[PDB]
Amino acid sequence: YVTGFFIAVSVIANVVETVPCGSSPGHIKELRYAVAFFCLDTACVM
Amino acid sequence: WKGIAIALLVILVICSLIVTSVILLTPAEDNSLSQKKKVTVEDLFSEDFKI
Numbered sequence: 001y002v003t004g005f006f007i008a009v010s011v012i013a014n015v016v017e018t019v020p021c022g023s024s025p026g027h028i029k030e031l032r033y034a035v036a037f038f039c040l041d042t043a044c045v046m
Numbered sequence: 047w048k049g050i051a052i053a054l055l056v057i058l059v060i061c062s063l064i065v066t067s068v069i070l071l072t073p074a075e076d077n078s079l080s081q082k083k084k085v086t087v088e089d090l091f092s093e094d095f096k097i
Binding site for chain 1: 054058068069
């Protein structure tokens with residue numbers, strides 16, 4: 001069940017990494033485009 | 047059959063807190079805008095730079 005939850009959160013990260021609020025610029029001049037997904041992705045991949 | 051799920055929840059929240067900690071740890075970003083206007087043509091003849 002824990003690896004199932006890990007798969008689920010990985011897929012959720014995969015789908016959310018394109019919406020223009022968490023991984024695409026929804027702000028042309030303000031400060032989010034966190035690359036932390038990468039880390040999260042790595043956190044999953046390993 | 048529920049306490050085992052509780053142990054699963056605690057181990058997963060430990061993992062999630064590890065993920066959040068590394069998320070706040072590894073990318074130590076700093077923008078440091080320092081938004082000051084670039085030197086223009088008239089600045090050399092502005093009274094401020096008049097040595």
